[PDB]
């Protein structure tokens, strides 16, 4: 029997989902590209990049700042160029992000009012920016990555531009706060350049202002799909600028719209928590150009801020998110009839809490604030507030617990903790080397020495810099398209032996004293967890497909891995949530503990096992003795306090009312 | 008290017919009744036996002056209702009906009874007033 | 009413008619009696639930601005 400390005094709240954007244009005929990714905008300024392959695994996270958010997300995918992401922060600035480092590559002032909407054209060489002053700004991006130039200003008008959509590279369609849709001409070499050809007014609420929240263009039949505050969806003929059909469908605001590749299905969502399906599959409907409201579905407990769609030969995804802070995935073709998945609110790919076996200290760092609890029944011994706007990326605590290191992309700071009067006295140790150092990852060799991996992936040792040589990685087309895959994702230091894993599956053993790098493994799948066991002299690596690999540290693979990698229990294979944390068992070194967002597992590595829909089919390549329990969930963090003590840390808004009839 | 509780526990395990004698013992007090039910009645089998014994006795003589046999059933029902209805024995249901019927009369009897208490409290005071 | 009938019970017996002159008393009383059967049922269920449940940072605060100032 083995002690569990089930703790919920640690609270983390994800920021509300604000924007969603897929990296590639849907092509049903072609297979899913290896580089397909989904970007998620958060109300706390964090941008989350996820991979639809191997169920859904989060490749990289861009960290936000205080009083920051993402109101619009936009991708640019030019053939032969690195994938580019652009975001709007609710101000007069357009930010292009360095995906390699996760830092702002370029900040561009629109020279206009507060930005409300962002959109990119078909040729992917221009951006349209909707401003609070009613001005639409056209920005050229074809120059290169990090290159942003003012192209042209469409006519200033007095209504806020809430949304923007394009028609090829010729026209800009914008929904305005005066309940009025505006069409501007973007055709160069045309006397009507930037001219407002047609302007449509929606039905207006009698006792309230009317806002056109979302507008989408439909190439196949050449109409505009618009959703306003009144809950009505209107379909408009572009060439004549006339209303074709109206559907008073939603009882509340329609905030977002999306359509399928073939423009046969138009999907709407908003405050009423429902997703409405509009259909024109039937041939007579296509001949008559008449849409039909097939169905609706209630899947969210709160507002649906963002909706996005993707299709391919092996992918058919409808992804939704909003105030509920969780992702809901559905099949576009089978929205009414298909199954759905509700993603966990928190999936701890990056560990935001740590537990110190010595002193029994639990440390959590949220929003530049670090809280320390002691367990004997729990007391918050210390809480620390940091000045810098940038959020804390990582925190590392020494084995003794006296020295706490707080790492941010901007700076790294070290604070010594002294126990006085059942409370910890905090003193900031001054180290110029660390202060001007970016800290992507930071681990302790011992009470004094530390290994730090910079945002540029420069590994060095600081005694409280002894740089460590790293093997060069061959460039690949996928690496060119997605830069961060070649970057260091998991670093681990264990008894002077350091292991680094990249998103491309390259695993290397690093000897910290020798400061030399030796290759270990080259896996075909993204690595989600890494662990070093000194007793068995092996390193445990977990891929995105939840396969467990044990490599001898110099057979390349241990005999257990050779026998058990494909022979894992049904529970491990059936999991749709990937493993994110591994920790050893003090009582028995061979036993290892593995836990995910909603599950915990223990495997004995001295015993061989008995031989006996909503994700990409994965036809294409990714690039170019046993205990299992799900009773505890959702899991922030799991680890040992002592040989028989387990720490489990778990998570403990008004919404549109939709009554449930009961009889 | 402890001895009788152990004796009752042993009789429950042994299927002894002296369960009724143990239950009617005068050493029992209300807090002990709660304590025994909560801590010693952990098996559905024991719970059914105690209910069956109590129900049969009360059904036979619902007008017994001994408040103890009713005293047991009160908290046995109050504290173990969720477990009692979980019992699927057909005989247990039949005894409940028999007990339900045996009790059922009394409630019809009481409204007539109270008025006739009134006639007596009435007749006294005149007799006392006439005496005075 | 009880004392009125108790003391003058003998007088009331020697009255030609009682029901007609005391019709309101019987009707008024009869309504109250009908409450007793049901009302007992409520006390039982009310007693059932009654018995059931009846037996059943600033000090540690550290801030960097405040330390930096003094």
């Amino acid at each position: 029997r083995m002690i569990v400390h089930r703790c919920r005094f640690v609270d983390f709240t994800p920021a509300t989902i604000t924007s969603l954007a897929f990296s590639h244009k849907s092509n049903i005929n072609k297979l899913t590209p290896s580089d397909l990714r989904l970007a998620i905008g958060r109300s706390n300024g964090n941008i989350e990049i996820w991979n639809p392959r191997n169920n859904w695994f989060q490749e990289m996270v861009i960290e936000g700042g205080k009083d920051r958010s993402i109101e619009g997300l936009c991708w640019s995918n030019v053939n032969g160029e690195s994938l580019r992401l652009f975001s709007i922060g609710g101000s007069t600035v357009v930010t292009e992000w360095d995906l390699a480092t996760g830092l702002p590559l370029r900040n561009y002032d629109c020279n206009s009012g507060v930005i409300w909407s962002i959109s990119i054209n078909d040729s992917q060489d221009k951006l349209s920016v909707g401003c609070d002053n009613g001005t639409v700004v056209l920005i050229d991006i074809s120059g290169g990555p990090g290159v942003l130039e003012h192209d042209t200003i469409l006519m200033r008008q007095e209504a806020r531009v809430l949304t923007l959509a394009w028609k090829k590279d010729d026209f800009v369609i914008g929904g305005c706060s005066d309940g009025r849709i505006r069409i501007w001409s973007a055709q160069k070499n045309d006397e009507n350049m930037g001219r407002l050809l047609h302007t449509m007014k929606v039905d207006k609420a009698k006792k309230e202002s009317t806002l056109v929240w979302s507008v989408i263009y439909l190439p196949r039949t050449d109409q505009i799909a618009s959703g306003d505050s009144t809950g009505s969806i209107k379909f408009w003929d572009f060439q004549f600028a006339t209303l074709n059909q109206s559907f008073k469908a939603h009882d509340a605001d329609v905030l977002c719209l999306t359509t399928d590749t073939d423009n046969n299905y138009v999907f709407s969502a908003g405050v009423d928590r429902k997703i409405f399906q509009f259909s024109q599959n039937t041939n007579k409907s296509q001949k008559n150009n008449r849409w039909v409201n097939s169905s609706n579905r209630l899947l969210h407990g709160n507002d649906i801020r963002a909706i996005c769609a993707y299709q391919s030969k092996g992918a058919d995804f409808l992804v939704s998110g909003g105030v509920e802070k969780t992702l809901v995935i559905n099949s576009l073709t089978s929205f009414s009839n298909g199954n759905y998945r509700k993603m966990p609110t928190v999936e701890p790919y990056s560990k935001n809490v740590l537990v110190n076996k010595e002193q029994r200290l639990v440390v959590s760092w949220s929003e530049s604030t670090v809280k320390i609890w002691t367990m004997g029944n729990y007391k918050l011994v210390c809480k620390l507030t940091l000045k810098d706007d940038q959020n804390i990326s990582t925190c590392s605590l020494s084995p003794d617990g006296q020295v706490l290191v707080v790492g941010r992309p901007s700076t790294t700071k070290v604070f010594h903790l002294q126990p006085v009067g059942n409370k910890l006295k905090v003193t900031k140790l001054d180290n110029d080397l660390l202060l001007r150092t970016s800290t992507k990852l930071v681990k302790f060799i011992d009470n004094s020495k530390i290994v730090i991996c910079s945002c540029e992936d420069d590994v060095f040792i600081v005694d409280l810099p002894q740089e460590v040589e790293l093997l060069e990685v061959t460039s690949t087309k996928s690496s060119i398209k997605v830069p961060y895959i070649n970057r260091i994702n998991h670093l681990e230091v264990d008894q002077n032996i350091a292991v680094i894993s990249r998103g491309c599956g390259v695993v290397d053993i690093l000897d910290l004293k020798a400061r030399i790098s030796k290759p270990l493994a080259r896996l075909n799948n993204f690595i989600t967890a890494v662990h070093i066991n000194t007793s068995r002299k092996s390193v445990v690596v977990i891929t995105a497909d939840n396969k467990i690999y044990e490599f001898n540290m110099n057979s390349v693979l241990t005999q257990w891995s050779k026998n058990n990698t494909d022979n894992l229990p049904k529970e491990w294979k059936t999991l749709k949530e990937n493993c994110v944390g591994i920790f050893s068992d003090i009582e028995n070194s061979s036993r290892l503990w593995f836990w995910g967002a909603t599950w915990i597992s223990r495997i004995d590595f001295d015993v061989d096992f008995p031989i006996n829909g909503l994700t990409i089919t994965d036809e294409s390549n990714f690039m170019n003795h046993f205990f299992f329990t799900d009773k505890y969930k959702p899991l922030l963090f799991v680890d040992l306090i002592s040989s028989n003590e387990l720490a489990i840390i778990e998570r403990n808004q008004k919404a549109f009312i939709q009554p449930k009839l009961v009889f | 008290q402890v001895e009788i509780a152990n004796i009752l526990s042993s009789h429950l395990e042994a299927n002894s017919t002296e369960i009724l004698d143990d239950l009617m013992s005068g050493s029992w007090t209300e807090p002990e009744i709660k304590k025994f039910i909560l801590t010693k009645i952990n098996t559905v089998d024991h719970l059914s036996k105690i209910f069956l014994t109590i129900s049969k006795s009360i059904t036979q003589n619902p007008w017994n002056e001994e408040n103890l046999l009713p005293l047991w059933l009160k908290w046995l029902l109050t504290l173990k209702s969720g477990e009692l209805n979980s019992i699927k024995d057909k005989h247990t249901k039949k005894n409940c009906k028999h007990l339900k019927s045996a009790l059922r009369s009394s409630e019809e009897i009481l409204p007539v009874l109270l008025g006739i208490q009134g006639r007596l409290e009435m007749l006294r005071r005149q007799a006392k007033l006439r005496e005075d | 009413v009880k004392w009125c009938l108790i003391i003058h019970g003998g007088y009331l017996v020697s009255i030609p008619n009682l029901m007609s002159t005391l019709s309101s008393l019987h009707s008024t009383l009869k309504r109250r009696s009908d409450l007793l059967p049901r009302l007992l049922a409520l006390d039982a269920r009310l007693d059932c639930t009654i018995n059931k449940f009846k037996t059943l940072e600033d000090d540690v605060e550290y801030n960097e601005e405040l330390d930096d100032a003094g």
Binding site: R1 | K74, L99 | -
Partner: peptide, 29 residues
């Protein structure tokens, strides 16, 4: 005595008719 018994039997008839933030446990493996 009958009144007491009848009210009692009435009560018996009517009877017949009718997460923590932190938890501490010790689990088997």
């Amino acid at each position: 005595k009958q009144v007491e018994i009848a009210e009692r039997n009435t009560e018996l008839w009517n009877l017949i008719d009718t997460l923590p933030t932190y938890t501490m446990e010790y689990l088997d493996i």
